[PDB]
């Protein structure tokens, strides 16, 4: 009850990033978190986006939850918001035609929700909590098998030959041809990271062809499209979003990248058209990091208070790891 945004702003002569700068999903604070400790469900592996696993609610905190990969090590646990599009209710993969990576010890054929729930004596999280159940409209113009050019987010200076390999509700999965699946990332039509076939060519940018493509220097889209019999995502399907309007020094709240259980008071350290650099007030600049303006883990001031999540105040002066802020 002691720390408060109101007096911090007066003390610092600062301003917060207006709620209007965030996506509705990042700002909404009046939804109830119906998830309960022990409930089971399905979800994508954040580090291997094309794979689906059985997950359990290991912890609830405000509008967030910590999920655990059944049968596996706790080191894989991760946090998501209750309105996350990356989780689905029990039975979702079977209904949508997706494959499942069963719990440790199980074979994909030995898994059955009904029996599993009995063996574990648990309940499945009710369906009415999921925003994504594949009941909504698919992304206009993006179908499994189409080709496009996309930025490798792990190596962002590369624009590469890619394919759509999955579609779930209003989002699709970008995959880099002949490269490892862990480079995949879910995306939507307004993403600034995707471009139609030929973009690089009109921009003078070098295009990164499929891994080990014969005579990589002579890569030709027309040729590749004939070889694969695949079509390119149509140009009209791409509807890139406008650059965000966050300004340097605006304050907000952001999940700690080192200990995701925590959320800290933060400031906009720097900006790009679609990214912002986060600085945790009072902490060393060595911890500042870049992040997409639409990332689900940044929120407007007051989010923690309204959702019931603890908020870490600025680090005290002269403390270890601090910065004369």
The piece of 5-13, 82-90, 155-163, 296-304 that touches ligand MLY (CB under 6 A) is 155-163
CB of 94 to ligand MLY, least distance (A): 31
| CB-based contact 164:142 (threshold 8 Å) | yes
Closer CB to ligand MLY, 152 or 281, in the complex: 152
Rule CB under 6 A: choose which of 9, 158, 225, 232 binds ligand MLY.
158
CB of 207 to ligand MLY, least distance (A): 11
Closer CB to ligand MLY, 115 or 155, in the complex: 155
Report in angstroms the alpha-carbon separations of 7 from 4, 12, 14, 170. 6, 8, 10, 41
Closer CB to ligand MLY, 82 or 160, in the complex: 160
Structure tokens at 58: 């290991």
Kindly state the greatest CA–CA separation across the chain: 66
Rounded Cα distance between 273 and 130, Å, is 31
Rule CB under 6 A: choose which of 152, 169, 253, 294 binds ligand MLY.
152
Rounded Cα distance between 260 and 66, Å, is 9
Closer CB to ligand MLY, 150 or 265, in the complex: 150
119 binds ligand MLY (CB under 6 A): no
**In 10 A of CB 257, how many CB atoms?**
14
| CB-based contact 244:276 (threshold 8 Å) | yes
CB of 20 to ligand MLY, least distance (A): 35
92 binds ligand MLY (CB under 6 A): no
Closer CB to ligand MLY, 160 or 254, in the complex: 160
Closer CB to ligand MLY, 52 or 176, in the complex: 176
- Interface residues for ligand MLY in 174-193 (CB under 6 A)? 176, 179, 183
Residue/partner pairs of 306-311 with CB below 8 Å, 24 or more apart: 306/29, 306/30, 307/29, 307/33, 307/62, 307/63, 307/64, 308/61, 308/62, 308/63, 309/61, 309/62, 309/63, 309/64, 309/263, 310/61, 310/62, 310/262, 310/263, 311/3, 311/253, 311/263, 311/264, 311/265
The piece of 3-11, 12-20, 153-161, 292-300 that touches ligand MLY (CB under 6 A) is 153-161
Q: After which residues is the chain broken (C to N over 2.5 A)?
A: none
Total residues at the site for ligand MLY (CB under 6 A)? 8
155 binds ligand MLY (CB under 6 A): yes
- Interface residues for ligand MLY in 205-224 (CB under 6 A)? 208
The piece of 124-132, 151-159, 257-265, 295-303 that touches ligand MLY (CB under 6 A) is 151-159
In the complex, the residues that contact ligand MLY under the rule CB under 6 A are 152, 155, 158, 160, 176, 179, 183, 208
């Amino acid at each position: 009850e002691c720390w408060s945004w109101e007096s911090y702003l007066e003390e610092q002569k600062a301003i917060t990033a207006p709620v209007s700068l965030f996506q509705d999903s990042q700002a909404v604070t009046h939804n109830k978190n119906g998830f309960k400790l022990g409930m089971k469900l399905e979800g994508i592996d954040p580090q291997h986006p094309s794979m689906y696993f059985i997950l359990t609610v290991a912890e609830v905190c405000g509008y967030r939850l910590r999920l655990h990969f059944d049968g596996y090590s706790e080191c894989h646990d991760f946090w998501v918001n209750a309105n996350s599009p990356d989780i689905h209710p029990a039975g979702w993969f079977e209904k949508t035609g997706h494959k499942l990576q069963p719990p440790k010890g199980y074979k994909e054929e030995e898994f059955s929700w009904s029996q599993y729930l009995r063996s574990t004596r648990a309940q499945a999280a009710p369906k009415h909590l999921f925003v994504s159940q594949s009941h909504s409209p698919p992304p206009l113009g993006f179908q499994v098998g189409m080709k496009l050019e996309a930025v490798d987010r792990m190596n962002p200076s590369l624009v590469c030959v890619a394919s759509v390999t999955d579609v779930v509700d209003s989002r699709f999965l970008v995959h880099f041809d002949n490269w490892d699946d862990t480079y995949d990332y879910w995306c939507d039509p307004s993403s600034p990271y995707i471009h139609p076939v030929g973009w690089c060519q009109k921009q003078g940018k070098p295009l990164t062809p499929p891994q080990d493509y014969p005579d990589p220097d002579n890569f030709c889209w027309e040729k590749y499209l004939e070889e694969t019999g695949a079509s390119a995502v149509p140009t009209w399907a791409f509807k890139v979003r406008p650059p965000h309007s966050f300004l340097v020094n605006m304050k907000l709240e952001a999940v700690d990248r080192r200990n995701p259980a925590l959320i800290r008071v933060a400031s906009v350290e720097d900006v790009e058209d679609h990214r912002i650099k986060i600085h945790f007030d009072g902490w060393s600049h060595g911890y500042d990091f870049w992040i997409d303006a639409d990332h689900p883990d940044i929120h407007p001031a007051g989010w923690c208070s309204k959702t019931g999540h603890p908020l870490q105040p600025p680090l005290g002066p002269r403390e270890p790891s601090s910065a004369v802020d």
